[PDB]
Amino acid sequence: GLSDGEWQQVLNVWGKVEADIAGHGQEVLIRLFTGHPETLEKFDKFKHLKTEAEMKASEDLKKHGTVVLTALGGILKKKGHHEAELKPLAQSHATKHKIPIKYLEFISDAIIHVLHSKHPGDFGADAQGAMTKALELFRNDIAAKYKELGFQ
């Protein structure tokens, strides 16, 4: 649950992402894959990537980064009223991709890391607080659907 002022911070930060969605999406996935190499094994189309240089050179990884952040941005713009947008993603990630909630924690922290890396000194403590709360809400509502499905 976020206040109006917190949502305003989230959507202000998101403007930074929308200026370069592919570059942000690429770096988020690279941070996930290099920090948590077990996550790469869930992607049949990226498991061939052995080095970060190959990851950086992969145009399909940048494409998928655009898909991921476009979906997340659509959810964030609903300011919590995201049941219709979130349900299909919860279902596909639990039942088809088999993504444990832990990996959603990993990618949430990766987003925070990338924002500081690309905007050092321009991602203030209030903005980090609000973005963190928004990603916690996203993860918590996914977790509720995971529990319904019995997925661990």
Binding residues for O2: 64
Tell me, rounded to whole angstroms, the distance of Cα 81 from its chain centroid.
18
Q: Which two tokens stand for residue 2?
A: 């976020």
Residue 113 binds ligand HEM, judged by CB under 6 A: no
Residue 104 binds ligand HEM, judged by CB under 6 A: yes
Residue 42 binds ligand HEM, judged by CB under 6 A: yes
Nearer to ligand HEM, 4 or 50 (CB): 50
Residue 103 binds ligand HEM, judged by CB under 6 A: yes
In angstroms, give the least distance from the CB of 21 to ligand HEM. 12
Part of the chain binding ligand HEM (CB under 6 A), chosen from 3-11, 68-76, 77-85, 117-125? 68-76
Residue 76 binds ligand HEM, judged by CB under 6 A: no
Closest among 137, 45, 152, 144 to 98, alpha carbons compared: 152
- Interface with ligand HEM: number of residues (CB under 6 A): 17
> What number of helices (H) and strands (E) belong to the chain?
7, 0
- Count of beta carbons in the 10 Å neighbourhood of residue 130: 22
Amino acid occupying residue 65: G
Which residues participate in the annotated binding site?
64, 93
Nearer to ligand HEM, 4 or 15 (CB): 15
In angstroms, give the least distance from the CB of 89 to ligand HEM. 5
Site for ligand HEM in 45-64 (CB under 6 A): 45
Part of the chain binding ligand HEM (CB under 6 A), chosen from 3-11, 42-50, 76-84, 119-127? 42-50
What contacts 118, CB < 8 A, 6 or more positions away? 16, 23, 24, 27
